[PDB]
Amino acid sequence: TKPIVFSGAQPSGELTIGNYMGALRQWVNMQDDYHCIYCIVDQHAITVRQDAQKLRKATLDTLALYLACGIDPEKSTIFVQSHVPEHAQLGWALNCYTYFGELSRMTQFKDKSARYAENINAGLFDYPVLMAADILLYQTNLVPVGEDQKQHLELSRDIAQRFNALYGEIFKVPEPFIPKSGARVMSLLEPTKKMSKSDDNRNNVIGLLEDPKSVVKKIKRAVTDSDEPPVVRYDVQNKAGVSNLLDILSAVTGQSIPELEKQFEGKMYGHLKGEVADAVSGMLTELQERYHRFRNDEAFLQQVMKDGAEKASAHASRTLKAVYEAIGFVAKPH
Amino acid sequence: KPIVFSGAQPSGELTIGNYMGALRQWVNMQDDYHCIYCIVDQHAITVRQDAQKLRKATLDTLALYLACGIDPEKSTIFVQSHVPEHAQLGWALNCYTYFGELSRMTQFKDKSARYAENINAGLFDYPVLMAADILLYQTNLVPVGEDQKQHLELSRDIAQRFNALYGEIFKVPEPFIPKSGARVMSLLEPTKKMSKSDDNRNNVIGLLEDPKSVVKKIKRAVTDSDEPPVVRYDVQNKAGVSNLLDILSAVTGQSIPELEKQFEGKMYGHLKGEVADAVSGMLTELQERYHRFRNDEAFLQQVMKDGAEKASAHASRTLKAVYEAIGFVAKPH
Ligand SMILES: Nc1ncnc2c1ncn2[C@@H]1O[C@H](COP(=O)(O)OC(=O)[C@@H](N)Cc2c[nH]c3ccccc23)[C@@H](O)[C@H]1O
Numbered sequence: 001t002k003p004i005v006f007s008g009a010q011p012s013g014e015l016t017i018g019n020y021m022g023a024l025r026q027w028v029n030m031q032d033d034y035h036c037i038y039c040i041v042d043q044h045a046i047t048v049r050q051d052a053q054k055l056r057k058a059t060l061d062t063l064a065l066y067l068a069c070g071i072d073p074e075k076s077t078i079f080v081q082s083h084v085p086e087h088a089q090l091g092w093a094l095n096c097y098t099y100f101g102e103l104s105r106m107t108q109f110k111d112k113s114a115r116y117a118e119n120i121n122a123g124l125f126d127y128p129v130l131m132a133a134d135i136l137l138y139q140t141n142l143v144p145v146g147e148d149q150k151q152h153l154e155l156s157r158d159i160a161q162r163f164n165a166l167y168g169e170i171f172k173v174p175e176p177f178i179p180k181s182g183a184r185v186m187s188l189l190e191p192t193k194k195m196s197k198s199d200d201n202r203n204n205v206i207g208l209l210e211d212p213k214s215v216v217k218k219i220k221r222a223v224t225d226s227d228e229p230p231v232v233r234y235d236v237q238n239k240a241g242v243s244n245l246l247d248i249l250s251a252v253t254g255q256s257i258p259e260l261e262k263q264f265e266g267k268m269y270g271h272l273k274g275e276v277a278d279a280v281s282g283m284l285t286e287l288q289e290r291y292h293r294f295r296n297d298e299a300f301l302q303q304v305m306k307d308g309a310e311k312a313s314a315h316a317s318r319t320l321k322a323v324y325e326a327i328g329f330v331a332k333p334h
Numbered sequence: 335k336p337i338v339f340s341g342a343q344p345s346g347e348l349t350i351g352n353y354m355g356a357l358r359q360w361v362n363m364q365d366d367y368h369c370i371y372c373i374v375d376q377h378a379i380t381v382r383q384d385a386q387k388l389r390k391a392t393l394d395t396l397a398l399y400l401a402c403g404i405d406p407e408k409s410t411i412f413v414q415s416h417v418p419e420h421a422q423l424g425w426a427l428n429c430y431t432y433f434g435e436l437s438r439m440t441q442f443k444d445k446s447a448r449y450a451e452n453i454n455a456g457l458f459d460y461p462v463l464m465a466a467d468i469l470l471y472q473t474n475l476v477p478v479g480e481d482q483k484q485h486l487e488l489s490r491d492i493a494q495r496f497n498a499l500y501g502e503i504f505k506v507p508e509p510f511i512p513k514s515g516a517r518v519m520s521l522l523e524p525t526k527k528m529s530k531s532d533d534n535r536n537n538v539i540g541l542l543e544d545p546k547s548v549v550k551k552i553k554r555a556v557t558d559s560d561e562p563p564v565v566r567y568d569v570q571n572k573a574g575v576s577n578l579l580d581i582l583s584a585v586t587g588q589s590i591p592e593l594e595k596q597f598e599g600k601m602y603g604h605l606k607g608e609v610a611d612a613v614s615g616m617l618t619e620l621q622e623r624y625h626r627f628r629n630d631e632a633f634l635q636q637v638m639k640d641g642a643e644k645a646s647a648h649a650s651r652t653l654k655a656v657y658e659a660i661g662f663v664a665k666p667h
């Protein structure tokens with residue numbers, strides 16, 4: 001059997017080119033090489049209060065965006081997290097193998113606390129435990145995520161090792177899979193800030209479903225450096241704006257950074273932003289065409305969801321049963 | 335007919351105080367209420383312990399409750415982890431519980447008993463799961479002791495806060511106010527009540543102790559320096575003999591005035607010998623039922639299977655409403 005890939009995305013907010021470049025691109029590319037399981041984490045999404053109607057619609061939006069990106073339900077398991085109760089069950093049990101300090105030192109918890117100071121709920125605190133549960137349920141070897149999930153991923157390796165040290169090889173120790181380029185896509189007008197699916201000025205964000213014409217406008221106004229003379233060179237430290245555009249172009253065309261640096265020799269930033277805008281506008285145009293064919297067929301969306309949850313429950317229930325014996329529960333009679 | 339919910343810790347070494355107080359009270363009311371008994375194994379693992387012991391004690395608790403008179407035809411008795419809806423609603427209710435509500439918990443600060451970053455998240459999140467245990471079943475009434483009062487109030491707050499956003503999904507549970515009546519005090523500390531959780535096991539008589547062991551603890555029971563020895567009820571100066579008369583009367587039904595006249599001209603040796611004899615007689619009938627249930631592994635399986643199925647039909651109904659209200663896509667059937 002192949003090694004197992006698992007990853008998740010929240011059906012909340014509008015997914016960005018950062019989501020694509022940090023995770024989704026790798027998800028598509030791994031579907032043949034490994035046994036991939038991809039999840040829409042609706043139980044994580046509600047740690048930030050959401051309108052109920054939007055959340056149900058956003059769940060179908062995310063699923064159709066997966067399919068438009070090229071996730072194939074005949075190659076990959078795709079499901080909605082809450083359709084598989086074993087995520088909640090293992091999430092509870094792993095709470096007991098997680099220290100309070102580990103959760104209270106989490107960068108994402110601190111950032112979300114500041115941003116959502118009226119709703120600092122315990123799900124927001126417990127978030128990494130459920131995410132560890134989503135991963136360890138499937139005997140996962142690889143987790144493709146962006147760089148902002150690395151602390152969370154390292155906790156789930158710790159929890160896996162802690163549990164294994166007590167009860168034997170019940171879990172696999174997962175390994176992160178974070179791309180060397182486009183792991184932290186930066187904001188267009190503030191290239192020191194990661195591009196956030198929660199930004200309150202949309203001029204920083206390229207949405208995957210946003211109007212391509214509005215997207216080209218944002219990329220043309222991307223903030224570049226004041227190097228004299230201007231030079232299209234890759235350097236994340238002192239040329240943040242330029243390098244972020246190079247990453248974004250690379251993710252659209254498939255050309256390497258050094259091939260792109262050669263192609264832009266003797267070229268200035270206005271030509272660079274225009275090439276990025278044309279490349280990105282083209283991919284979003286094709287992406288949104290596939291998106292709508294999938295999104296408007298809800299009975300197809302329902303079929304993918306059902307088949308995926310059934311495929312996922314088979315695997316999760318094997319692990320959860322082994323956890324429950326490890327720890328001492330009486331097994332439920334059948 | 336009101337729904338009543340109680341969690342049974344599958345690690346409680348239950349005493350005669352539990353049995354003649356709360357348990358006797360509820361065994362006699364299974365037809366007046368729709369009672370639900372949940373052995374909380376998912377709560378237990380918040381304190382690290384031996385896996386085999388936890389498995390055995392879960393079955394001991396079940397057989398002990400059946401021995402005390404819990405009728406699985408009348409009431410619902412089940413094991414928490416056999417109903418996934420507890421963990422599911424437990425996670426969802428996390429998203430509606432303030433971090434501060436959980437950190438201001440005295441039970442969390444007490445059961446902490448160490449430094450944070452050495453206290454597991456199960457100990458921190460414990461109250462939300464209790465809230466989930468209660469609300470899944472549309473519970474009207476919860477019997478709680480003083481140490482569980484703060485937990486129940488959080489449950490009531492969560493229910494109301496959830497209802498205010500989504501509609502009447504949850505029933506707001508109430509405490510069950512009236513007390514059992516039976517008074518059972520600690521054997522060496524006759525001012526404080528006998529508790530299942532005392533680390534001094536000589537203060538208690540457990541439900542499975544043999545008569546030779548019952549005598550040892552009864553004979554060492556604190557009494558008073560009153561000359562001459564008089565067997566008379568008075569809680570301020572005869573608190574010790576007062577406990578023994580209370581325990582005896584709890585066991586036999588005899589009134590305190592009838593007991594006082596029964597022990598007119600008797601000394602403290604006859605009172606303790608009569609207390610131990612009466613306690614051991616009650617415990618002998620209790621234990622023979624316990625061993626009958628506990629060794630019938632097929633009977634226990636059938637009770638767990640029936641209980642969990644009964645619990646799931648109620649639990650899933652509530653959970654489906656919760657998820658629809660929250661806005662999840664419902665699971666394709
Ligand atoms: N600017 C950016 N540049 C590069 N990558 C980025 C950028 N912004 C976001 N990402 C990545 O996109 C993925 C989706 O993030 P979510 O917030 O939906 O989702 C999250 O942040 C997870 N907690 C969801 C989750 C729950 N359980 C899991 C188990 C495995 C993996 C993931 C999960 C993520 O990989 C994130 O790193």
Ligand SMILES: C[C@H]1c2c[nH]c3cccc(c23)S[C@H]1C(=O)O
Nearest residue numbers: 339340341342343374464467482
């Ligand atoms: C057993 C524990 C428990 C778990 N779920 C519930 C629900 C109601 C009452 C209680 C509980 S009582 C409580 C305790 O700590 O006494």
